[PDB]
């Protein structure tokens, strides 16, 4: 659905079947609600417990087609420019892509061979560093996040006696805003996420209906003005 | 369904906006009567009873045809006095008997009469023989007839 279809069809649902019976939303407000709705839909359909089916990213064909146009593969760049301090002796700091939303697969190409990266929690790190050897298994590497400035920095703790030659990251790209008009034309300097012009949906058409319905629900709740409605539909913001 | 509304008819009302009309009145009605007449139908819409022709028989019994356009009437006590124009300018006296009007032609001549000037009358009863009917046009002299 083009942006013009998202605006026209919001009023067949929010505005009492385009009857001007409900309050009436500007195009900036519709754009804001659509952007928030798409963020909510992505977050809910990612986590299995966030949706109504109990199914996550790759738990059904529908979920696979939902995130199909967000999945991106990018390389990490060595953060040798800044001589920071790492928590681990053998940690090579790598910076991740800027348009990163959620990581789902990471791999590192060493001289010994490719090794799947395990994002290791702060408890497992303390548990595995209390042992004699203190290295990953032969076919894996660890990863912990470190001091990050306006980006995402990750320490790659690969086994000693090995050098990192590559670092591939497969992640969900940050969705672009949904904007139904040139905001600068009538609204002075309002931006949704830094873009003031018409922005289409960068998602598969399968979830456009989901996003529009969530936007309509959010609009109706924000206008009913009840605290109860706001807190109830705020549950699904995550 | 969902809702209802009851309509009574206390009269006939017009001139009011349709949005603000009163259900107790009717907007327009033809040949109805809301007052109880010949039956106890008060505040209930009911029909109009029709008319019945009354033959105009002369005292001899022959029919009496009235000449033309009527200009005015006058009921003194039981005598109806008609001032009609036509081929001539006539005057009649009609008394209601049981089933017919005993019609008499009091005059048939050229009393100048016009349809543009109808008749207005006053009729007095002084006694059995002096029963007068004073009438005036807007055009001619005032006149009297016993």
């Amino acid at each position: 659905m083009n942006v013009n279809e998202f605006s026209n069809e919001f009023d067949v649902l929010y505005n009492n079947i385009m009857s001007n019976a409900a309050p009436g939303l500007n195009e900036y407000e519709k754009s804001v609600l659509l952007t928030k709705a798409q963020e909510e839909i992505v977050k809910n359909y990612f986590e299995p417990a966030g949706n109504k089916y109990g199914k996550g990213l790759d738990d059904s064909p529908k979920r696979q087609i939902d995130f199909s146009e967000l999945i991106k593969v990018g390389e990490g760049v060595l953060n040798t420019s800044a001589p920071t301090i790492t928590f681990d002796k053998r940690a090579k700091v790598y910076d991740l892509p800027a348009d990163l939303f959620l990581v789902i697969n990471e791999a590192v190409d060493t001289n010994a061979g490719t090794k799947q990266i395990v994002p290791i929690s702060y408890s497992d790190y303390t548990r595995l560093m209390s042992r004699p050897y203190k290295e990953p298994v032969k076919y894996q590497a660890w990863r912990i996040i470190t001091t990050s400035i306006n980006n995402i920095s990750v320490e790659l703790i690969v086994n000693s006696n090995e050098t990192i030659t590559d670092y591939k990251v497969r992640y969900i790209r940050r969705p672009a805003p949904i904007i139904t008009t040139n905001l600068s034309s009538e609204y002075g300097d309002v931006t949704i996420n830094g873009v003031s012009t018409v922005s289409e949906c960068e998602l598969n058409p399968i979830i456009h209906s989901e996003i529009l319905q969530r936007a309509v629900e959010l609009a109706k709740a924000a206008y009913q003005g009840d605290l109860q409605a706001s807190v109830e539909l705020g549950q699904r913001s995550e | 369904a969902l809702k209802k509304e009851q309509h009574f008819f206390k009269g006939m009302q017009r001139d009011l906006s349709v949005s603000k009309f009163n259900p107790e009145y009717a907007f327009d009605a033809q040949n109805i009567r809301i007052t109880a007449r010949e039956h106890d139908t008060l505040l209930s819409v009911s029909n109009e009873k029709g008319n019945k022709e009354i033959p105009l028989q002369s005292p001899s019994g022959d029919p009496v045809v009235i000449d033309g356009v009527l200009l005015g009437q006058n009921v003194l006590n039981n005598y109806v006095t008609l001032f009609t124009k036509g081929t001539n300018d006539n005057i009649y006296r009609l008394e209601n008997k049981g089933t017919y009007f005993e019609t008499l032609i009091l005059f048939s001549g050229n009393l100048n009469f016009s349809t543009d000037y109808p008749i207005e009358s006053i009729s007095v009863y002084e006694n059995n023989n002096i029963q007068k009917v004073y009438w005036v046009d807007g055009l001619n002299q005032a006149r009297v007839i016993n």
């Binding site: - | 369904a1 809702k3 209802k4 309509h7 349709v18 907007f27 039956h39 139908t41 819409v45 029909n47």
Partner: protein
Amino acid sequence: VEFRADSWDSDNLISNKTFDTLDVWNEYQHGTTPLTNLLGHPSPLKKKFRIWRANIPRAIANNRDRIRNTWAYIKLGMNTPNTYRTEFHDAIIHYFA
């Protein structure tokens, strides 16, 4: 249009003939039916337990749309020759708001 009414003929009740038309209209609609009563088949007018009930006509333009408006003029009348006294007490109109 539920309504109570009775037609007589010289002290004889007539439980078959009350009204012969029902014109209902507004600013953009106009419908009319003859108010016939067929005992076996459905008809515009049906009587039962001494109450008359007539289905309001539908628009002449489409012949499918019901009379939908904030208000409407309701007109009952007889236009067939007859000589009866027809007492018409009141009329309830059932609508859906």
